[PDB]
Amino acid sequence: TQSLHGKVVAALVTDGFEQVELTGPKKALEDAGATVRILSDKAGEVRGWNHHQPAEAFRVDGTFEDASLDDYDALLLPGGVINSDQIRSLAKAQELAIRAEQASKPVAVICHGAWLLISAGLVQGRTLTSWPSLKDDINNAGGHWVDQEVAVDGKLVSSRKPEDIPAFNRRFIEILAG
Amino acid sequence: TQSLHGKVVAALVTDGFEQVELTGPKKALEDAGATVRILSDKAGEVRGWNHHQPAEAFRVDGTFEDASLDDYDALLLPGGVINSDQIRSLAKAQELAIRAEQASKPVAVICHGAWLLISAGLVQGRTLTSWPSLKDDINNAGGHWVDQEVAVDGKLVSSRKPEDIPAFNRRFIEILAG
Numbered sequence: 001t002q003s004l005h006g007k008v009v010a011a012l013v014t015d016g017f018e019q020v021e022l023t024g025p026k027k028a029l030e031d032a033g034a035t036v037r038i039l040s041d042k043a044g045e046v047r048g049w050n051h052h053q054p055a056e057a058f059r060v061d062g063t064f065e066d067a068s069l070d071d072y073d074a075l076l077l078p079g080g081v082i083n084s085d086q087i088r089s090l091a092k093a094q095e096l097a098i099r100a101e102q103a104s105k106p107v108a109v110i111c112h113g114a115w116l117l118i119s120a121g122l123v124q125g126r127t128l129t130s131w132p133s134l135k136d137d138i139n140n141a142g143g144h145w146v147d148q149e150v151a152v153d154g155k156l157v158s159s160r161k162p163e164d165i166p167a168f169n170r171r172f173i174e175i176l177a178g
Numbered sequence: 179t180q181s182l183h184g185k186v187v188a189a190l191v192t193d194g195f196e197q198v199e200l201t202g203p204k205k206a207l208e209d210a211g212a213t214v215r216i217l218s219d220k221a222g223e224v225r226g227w228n229h230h231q232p233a234e235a236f237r238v239d240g241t242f243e244d245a246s247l248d249d250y251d252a253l254l255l256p257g258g259v260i261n262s263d264q265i266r267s268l269a270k271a272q273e274l275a276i277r278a279e280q281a282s283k284p285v286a287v288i289c290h291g292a293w294l295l296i297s298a299g300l301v302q303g304r305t306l307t308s309w310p311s312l313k314d315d316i317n318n319a320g321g322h323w324v325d326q327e328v329a330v331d332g333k334l335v336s337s338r339k340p341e342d343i344p345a346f347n348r349r350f351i352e353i354l355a356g
Binding site for chain 2: 016052054081082085086088089112115118119132133136137140141142
């Protein structure tokens with residue numbers, strides 16, 4: 001079984017993130033030996049959601065403003081339409097995603113989460129999947145939208161919905177290990 | 179002031195629409211003498227939301243499947259991130275908006291509601307505003323995004339947020355009268 005001991009992943013979330021899109025990948029990554037930190041726009045706690053109902057609050061380990069991608073081997077971008085619509089316009093979240101591309105570090109994204117990638121200018125020429133509502137936005141941004149349980153372009157790992165999470169986790173672990 | 183007597187407006191909404199972006203314009207049009215029909219994807223009731231909480235239920239006058247634009251002088255597209263994300267993929271909602279473009283009928287859209295126009299191919303070469311989170315999607319789809327309280331491009335009337343509603347209402351009434 002692949003070990004990710006020593007690996008640190010940053011999950012980028014604002015209030016309204018799909019809770020399982022963080023906790024599923026977080027548990028799979030922790031089971032393999034990695035550390036996962038939660039970064040948000042504000043300090044304190046960030047609220048996850050189960051579909052259209054608010055769910056549990058999670059302790060924020062750090063802010064986008066304060067984060068350095070030197071400290072992380074990869075980014076996790078959970079969906080949640082509310083979180084995804086909010087986070088995509090945040091300059092420091094965009095900067096983290098841009099720095100990950102420049103540094104050839106994995107970015108795992110799921111559901112509505114690729115809006116951050118569109119707005120950071122990062123989907124042009126890349127193949128990814130997403131929740132189908134984002135298909136037009138990704139294609140209009142220059143992306144190559146495909147319908148796959150888990151898409152991979154280099155170290156860009158993408159999935160469309162919560163049911164994809166098990167395969168998403170397995171592929172993200174393979175890509176993080178290299 | 180301006181009478182809209184004899185005019186009929188279809189508001190296209192799904193569950194999770196921003197309630198005031200329906201009720202505010204609806205009252206203004208009705209005060210002006212117009213009739214406002216609430217159309218949804220499903221019969222019965224459609225759930226309005228107040229920001230991030232579901233709110234009151236509204237009677238559905240007709241479904242997108244059954245609707246003809248022959249019976250409406252204009253479309254009203256309230257926002258709400260949940261509604262706007264859902265409604266954009268429904269071909270029958272896209273059809274109603276395309277028929278509006280083809281028949282030179284006003285379309286008033288606010289906040290997140292322009293996602294449907296993007297997916298219907300209707301923002302190409304158009305000038306419009308929106309909630310800023312859609313800026314990149316509107317520009318990537320060939321639109322010209324502007325930051326105005328109420329933007330107008332022909333009969334396309336667009337606003338950004340609930341505080342724009344009074345001006346949105348006043349402009350819509352003007353465009354509807356012609």
